[PDB]
C-alpha cells in the first residue's frame, strides 16, 4: 500500500517554464511507477500564498495513473491566484490533512502504508515560517522514529526537486529525507 503526494510550487518565482516542466517530469514519474505493475493512491497540490488541492488520496479514482495524469496536465501556472507568496509550510500542511484519521483512530492497516511526498520547489519560502515542523508533525502521525525497535522509517519518504536557476539549496536539503546509502534531492531535469 502507497500513497504519493505529488506538491509542486506554482509561486513567481518558479516560472511558467520551469513549471511546465515541472509538470511534464511528474507525468512521467506517474507513468515510471505504473510501469512497474503499482497502484498508488495519489494527492496532488499546487501553491503559492496558499495551497490548491487538486486530488486527495481517498478520491475514488486517486489510484487511476490515466486519470491523475489527466488531472494534473488541465493545471495551468496561471491557474494560481496570489503566486506573489509561497507558503511552503501551508502546502505541507495540505498533506498532512490528507493524511489525517477519519474516525480518531489509525484506519484498519494504518502501518502498512508508504507515504511518498514528492515536492517541487525552488526552496525560496518566504510566509508561513520554517516548513520542516510540518515534516516533523506527519513523523508524529505515523509513528515514525517514537519505537527504538521499529522506527519505521520505511513508511515516509520525502523526495524534492529543486526547480529554476534560483534555489536555495540549504532549505531544499533540509525538507527532504537523509537515508543511508539513498539519495533524496534532485533536479527537475532528473523516484517514488
Ligand atoms: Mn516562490
Redo the contacts with the bound molecule.
Sequence with gaps: SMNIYLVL?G????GASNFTGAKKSLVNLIEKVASYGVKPRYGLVTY?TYPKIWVKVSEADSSNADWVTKQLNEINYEDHKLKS??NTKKALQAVYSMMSWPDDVPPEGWNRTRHVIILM??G???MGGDPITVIDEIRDLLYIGKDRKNPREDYLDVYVFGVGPLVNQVNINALASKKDNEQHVFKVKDLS
Design positions: 510550487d509561486s513567481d518565482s518558479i503559492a507568496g509561497t520547489t525552488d525560496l519560502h518566504n
